[PDB]
C-alpha cells in the first residue's frame, strides 16, 4: 500500500532554490548519503 509516496522536500533546499530557478542547465543527481535525487551546489552555474 505504498504506490503513492508523498514527497517531503523539494529536490533543492530553500538555500539553493533561486539558484536552481535561474540556471537553465541545472540538473539533479543521486545523493551519495541519502541515495535520493537532489540538486547539488557544485552542479549549479558550472562550466561542466
Amino acid at each position: 500500500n505504498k504506490l503513492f509516496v508523498s514527497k517531503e522536500h523539494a529536490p533543492y533546499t530553500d538555500e539553493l532554490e533561486e539558484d536552481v530557478y535561474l540556471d537553465p542547465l541545472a540538473r539533479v543527481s543521486k545523493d551519495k548519503k541519502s541515495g535520493s535525487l537532489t540538486f547539488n551546489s557544485k552542479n549549479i552555474q558550472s562550466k561542466d
Binding site: 504506490l3 503513492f4 514527497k7 537553465p24 542547465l25 540538473r27 535525487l37 537532489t38
Partner: protein
C-alpha cells in the same frame, strides 16, 4: 476529486516507467514540466460545504474554499509529487475538458 487525481497521476507515471518523478529533472530543467489537466466543475463537495453546510452551521474546515478551485487539484499534484516550476494551464471545458 483530488484523491482521484493524485492516484491517477501516480499510476500514469508508473505506466511511463517513472517511479520517482524527480528523475525527470536529470533530463530537463524544473521550469519544463507542465500540468495542463483540468475539470468541468472542480471540488463540488467543497462547494457544498461553503453553500450548504456552512449555512446550517455544520463544522466546515476553515480553508474549504481553496479546496473547491478547479486548479487546486493540479496544485496538490505539484505540492505532493512533482515539485516543478513549469507552466500550469488549467482548462475548463465541461465535457470536452
Amino acid at each position: 476529486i483530488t484523491l482521484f487525481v493524485l492516484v491517477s497521476v501516480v499510476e500514469a507515471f508508473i505506466a511511463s516507467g517513472i517511479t520517482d518523478p524527480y528523475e525527470m529533472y536529470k533530463y530537463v530543467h524544473v521550469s519544463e514540466v507542465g500540468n495542463c489537466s483540468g475539470s468541468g466543475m472542480g471540488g463540488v463537495s467543497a462547494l457544498r460545504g461553503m453553500f450548504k453546510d456552512r449555512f446550517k452551521d455544520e463544522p466546515v474546515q476553515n480553508d474549504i474554499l481553496q479546496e473547491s478551485f478547479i486548479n487546486t487539484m493540479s496544485a496538490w499534484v505539484n505540492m505532493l509529487l512533482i515539485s516543478s516550476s513549469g507552466p500550469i494551464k488549467t482548462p475548463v471545458g465541461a465535457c470536452a475538458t
